[PDB]
Amino acid sequence: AMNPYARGPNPTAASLEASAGPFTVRSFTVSRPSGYGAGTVYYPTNAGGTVGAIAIVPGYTARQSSIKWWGPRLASHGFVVITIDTNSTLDQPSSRSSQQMAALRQVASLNGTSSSPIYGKVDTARMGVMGWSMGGGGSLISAANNPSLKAAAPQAPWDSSTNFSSVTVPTLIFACENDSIAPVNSSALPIYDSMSRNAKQFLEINGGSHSCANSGNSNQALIGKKGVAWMKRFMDNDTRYSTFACENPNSTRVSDFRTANCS
């Protein structure tokens, strides 16, 4: 049956691995950030309908630059994306989560503000969370606390606690094989194994350092394909993307692939 959220032409591996999707992207800096430090909004000009929104948070000491590449990559496939700086560079995961949710809230405000470039462009019922390291831990906290979120795709997550057993939101964990800041054995993998209630996926990048999914990474084709496919499948209920979302990509750039409850 027709999916009112489907946007864009039918996907291929090549179209998803490309540096950009079908839609023209513009961006702006949020003038008066509400509940977080600073933000940049990326949006499609010509998506053909309202789109979901995704809020992305950096790691400790880090800024938007570390996660910026997701903004154009996701927006060009039909999402509104807000990348944030935190109130302090030394904010911890819980605070990062609150700020992430504040950023989504502001996206909803701007959707209703006629002066904004994103006026009327957002479906405020359909949201997702992403982020690096402690910002990835924050993303998981956001999902735990707000199960109406449609998707979560943290990268190299870290939190003091690895128990996210309550999470019912579809969650893709990007992991970095050689991470020594948040080692996979003590962070990303126990987090992944804790979650028994959801669609989930574990994608570990072969030879990756802790920054393996950050801006400038050497795996933007694969990582971008997977992120976009996960968000399309789960934020847009778009079953054109189910295979790309759920499949083992059979890539030598991947040292560990796992998934559950994905169809």
Author numbering: -1 to 261
What does the paper say about this structure?
Specifically, I. sakaiensis adheres to PET surface and secretes a unique cutinase-like enzyme that degrades PET. By hydrolyzing PET, the enzyme produces mono-(2-hydroxyethyl) terephthalic acid (MHET), TPA and bis-2(hydroxyethyl) TPA (BHET). The enzyme is named PET hydrolase (PETase) for its PET preference. PETase adopts the canonical ɑ/β-hydrolase fold, in which the strictly conserved catalytic triad S131-H208-D177, as predicted from sequence alignment with homologous enzymes that exhibit PET-hydrolytic activity, is found on the protein surface.
The recombinant protein of wild-type PETase without signal peptide was expressed and crystallized in the orthorhombic space group P212121. The structure was solved at 1.58 Å resolution, and three polypeptide chains were observed in an asymmetric unit, which are denoted A, B, and C chain. S131 serves as the nucleophile and is located within hydrogen-bond distance to be polarized by the base H208, which is in turn stabilized by the acid D177. First, PETase forms two intra-molecular disulfide bridges (DS1 and DS2) while the other homologous enzymes have only one. The strictly conserved DS2 (C244-C260) connects the C-terminal helix and the last loop, while the PETase-specific DS1 (C174-C210) links two loops that harbor the catalytic acid and base. Second, W156 adjacent to the catalytic center displays variable conformations in the crystal structures. Interestingly, an equivalent Trp is found in every PET-hydrolyzing enzyme, but W156 wobbling has not been observed before. Among the surrounding amino acids a distinct S185 is found in PETase, which is consistently replaced by a His in the homologous enzymes. Further analyses indicate that a His side chain would be too close to allow “A” or “B” conformer of W156 in PETase, while a Ser residue can yield a space to accommodate the “C” conformer of W156. The apo-form enzyme provides a shallow cleft for substrate binding onto the protein surface, with the W156 side chain in various conformations.
